[model samples]
Target: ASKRALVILAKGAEEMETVIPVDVMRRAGIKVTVAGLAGKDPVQCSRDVVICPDASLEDAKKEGPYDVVVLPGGNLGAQNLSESAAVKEILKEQENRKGLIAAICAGPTALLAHEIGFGSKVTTHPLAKDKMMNGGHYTYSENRVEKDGLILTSRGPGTSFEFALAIVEALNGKEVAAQVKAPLVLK
Candidate 1:
């Protein structure tokens, strides 16, 4: 069976974090859904790059129980996710199922907002530390990619590929992750 992933795209999401993972996951043969948080419309990213979502979150949730749920971060985008009851439900459901939940940059802060992965060793962009550490609910790490069971996290845009490949490895396998990584010309 093919692996599936859901990527939530809100206004102000980091385009690099969102696109790199989506592209890499597709290369690893994952069926990825880039869902818009608001509606099935073009979303303006943090850098002003607009992307059309595959579907609205409201509609996509009806199609899920995906193998992975990916969250890409910009401060505002993460904030949007933090404020959404819909996002909270999705993360909770994914966790309850023991599925993977990958977050990058300020993205992991949503885990704090929804209280999804407490006790997991997680990482976020340096600027996001205080927010992610607010309640001391999770142990913080500076590793480019940190995976604790089903929860995976990384620091920032520079770590997006590592983050994505970690998800690929978790969902597909180490061999597939390596195959997908080789052509990226990563050092």
Candidate 2:
């Protein structure tokens, strides 16, 4: 069976962080849902790139129980995610289901905001470190990609591809991840 992924898209989201994972996950045969946090309109990314979401978060939530919920980050974007009670509900349900929760860059801060993954080994953009570690809830790491059980996190835009591949590996398998990675021409 194909794995399903939910990507929450909000204003100020890092374009690279959002696009890479969605693209790579699709290549790995995951059915990905790019959902808009603010209704069905297109989201304005951190770099001013506008991406049309597949559905509104309100609508997407009805299609529950995805295999993974992906969070991409920009400071403002993460803040929007953090303030969303809907996102909190989704994360809580995902945690309860033991489904994977993947976040990148400042994205992990949203996890912290929601109190989603305490004590997990996690990483975030260097600028976001203090916020992620504010209460000493999670063990911080310098790894480009860190996966402690179901909580997966990564650094900044430079690590987006690596982060995506890691999610691919987790949802699919090493073989599928490697196969999907080959054509990307990564060094």
Candidate 3:
């Protein structure tokens, strides 16, 4: 078994942001588990795309630490993720273990709402940058996805490939991530 990550999906995640990283990481040979929070079975995304997670956060704990925790973004997804006590608890406990926690688009704002933004650099959808600028460095880049510490964020859907690649680089390393990117016809 390679390293594992837990991607928490809620009712309305952004389709691209949620699936891209999981695809990239799985191709990179990382065990990417989709954990549905606030609901069981399949969760719906912004465009009604349903994702069936591997498990739920009800099964996680501080000791069963995963290497990374990914929170994907959407308007409703971010709101639900931030408001969920289970999601918040998992983030809180994982942060203490130095596990990498990443979010993109409005997803980064969800992290900020959980009080994880005070001392970190974050990037989000261009329109949401000022709102995400909660005493943290905010950069505007349509193609420049950013990785700061354990938190990775990107501007918008256009940056999903780069953003997902950044996560693969963080979790598996540059070599595997690079390979996954090759077939995408992107550089």
**Model 1 C-alpha lDDT per residue in residues 1-187, reported as the tens digit of each score:** 8999999999999999999999999999999999999999999999999999999999999999999999999999999999999999999999999999999999999999999999999999999999999989999999999999778999999999999999999999999999999999999
Candidates' RMSD to native? 0.6, 0.6, 2.2
Which of 2 and 3 is ahead in TM-score?
Answer: 2
The candidate 2 region of ten consecutive residues with least summed lDDT is 166-175
Residue-wise lDDT of candidate 2 within 73-116, one digit each (tens)?
Answer: 99999999999999999999999999999999999999999999
Which regions of candidate 2 deviate over 4 angstroms? Answer: none
Residue pairs clashing, model 1 = none
lDDT of candidate 2 vs native?
0.95
In order, the Cα lDDT scores of the candidates are 0.97, 0.95, 0.78
TM-score of each: 0.99, 0.99, 0.90
How many residue-pair clashes does candidate 2 contain? 0
Roughly what TM-score does model 3 have, to 2 decimal places? 0.90
